[PDB]
Amino acid sequence: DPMNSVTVSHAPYTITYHDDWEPVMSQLVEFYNEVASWLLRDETSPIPDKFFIQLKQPLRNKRVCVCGIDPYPKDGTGVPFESPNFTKKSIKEIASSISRLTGVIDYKGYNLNIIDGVIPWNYYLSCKLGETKSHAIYWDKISKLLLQHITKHVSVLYCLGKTDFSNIRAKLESPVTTIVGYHPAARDRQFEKDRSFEIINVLLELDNKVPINWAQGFIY
Amino acid sequence: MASSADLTNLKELLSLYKSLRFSDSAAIEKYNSLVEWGTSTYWKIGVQKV
DNA sequence: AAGATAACAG
DNA sequence: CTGTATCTT
Ligand SMILES: O=c1cc[nH]c(=O)[nH]1
Numbered sequence: 001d002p003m004n005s006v007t008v009s010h011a012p013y014t015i016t017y018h019d020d021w022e023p024v025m026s027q028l029v030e031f032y033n034e035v036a037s038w039l040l041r042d043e044t045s046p047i048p049d050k051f052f053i054q055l056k057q058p059l060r061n062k063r064v065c066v067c068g069i070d071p072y073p074k075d076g077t078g079v080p081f082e083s084p085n086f087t088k089k090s091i092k093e094i095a096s097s098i099s100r101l102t103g104v105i106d107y108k109g110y111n112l113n114i115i116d117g118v119i120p121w122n123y124y125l126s127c128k129l130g131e132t133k134s135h136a137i138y139w140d141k142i143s144k145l146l147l148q149h150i151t152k153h154v155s156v157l158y159c160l161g162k163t164d165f166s167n168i169r170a171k172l173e174s175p176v177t178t179i180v181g182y183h184p185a186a187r188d189r190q191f192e193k194d195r196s197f198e199i200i201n202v203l204l205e206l207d208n209k210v211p212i213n214w215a216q217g218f219i220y
Numbered sequence: 221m222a223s224s225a226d227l228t229n230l231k232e233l234l235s236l237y238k239s240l241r242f243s244d245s246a247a248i249e250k251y252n253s254l255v256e257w258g259t260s261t262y263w264k265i266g267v268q269k270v
Numbered sequence: 271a272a273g274a275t276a277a278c279a280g
Numbered sequence: 281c282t283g284t285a286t287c288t289t
Contacts, residue, residue, distance in 0.1 A: 057223040073283080089279085089284050132285085155266070163286060181223060185284050186277045191224040202230040206237065207266025208257075 005067045009089050010036035011048040017055040024149045039138040042128035050078025051125045059153040062119045069164045070124035073132050079113045080120040083125045092192050093184035098214045111217035117212045151176040155207045
């Protein structure tokens with residue numbers, strides 16, 4: 001009913017999407033065909049049926065994009081940061097930080113993809129199994145096309161990782177409010193000091209928008 | 221690391237956006253300097269210099 | 271580009 | 281031990 005398909009040469013063959021994405025689907029297909037064979041040589045996180053599942057999200061109700069680098073080196077589900085287990089480092093830190101911010105102290109898990117206002121995103125859509133950033137070379141032009149498309153819709157873009165996103169503006173035509181923070185899996189304890197979730201709500205008020213309710217993310 | 225001091229700055233910017241009277245030159249200075257700071261730090265923000 | 275670095279879980 | 285980014289040459 002909002003869900004169109006489109007087809008591609010290599011796995012996963014169909015890509016389903018929501019109308020909000022229609023403008024990009026042509027170039028995406030063209031691009032994915034030029035590289036898929038090559039990237040598919042590797043086992044990947046997530047599996048190929050999951051590379052695009054985040055295209056089923058609408059954009060018109062979104063005012064914040066929370067953008068990671070690429071999937072978990074292992075056990076990616078296709079939803080950025082999602083750990084069905086609540087075992088991954090990165091979602092744990094994020095969950096702590098929301099806890100401090102909100103007062104919620106008892107929770108089973110956390111998921112960024114059930115939060116009104118918010119689209120969690122991964123800049124690159126896959127990696128070779130166990131190797132962070134291994135597929136950057138393949139996703140490159142596609143990564144830039146989708147992010148630019150996402151940022152037309154949202155007020156605030158929050159990038160998780162100083163290394164990979166310090167040059168993010170060069171990546172986009174069109175200015176958008178952009179915050180670059182430490183990644184949750186930083187190897188000192190730098191994400192514990194990040195105030196970026198508060199910082200988003202203050203930025204949202206300054207653009208006359210409703211604050212994100214970060215508590216919505218908890219799984220009880 | 222520096223995002224606390226970024227928060228503090230943004231809060232003050234928002235506090236001024238709300239409090240600010242055009243007759244008060246010191247507030248406009250402070251506000252305009254926060255909007256510049258904010259604009260260049262986050263690339264774009266929802267408020268303008270006055 | 272290469273190497274040193276940090277800390278915590280498992 | 282290995283698995284999970286940052287910063288300075
Ligand atoms: O999906 C994910 C998982 C971990 N780190 C990221 O940047 N993205």
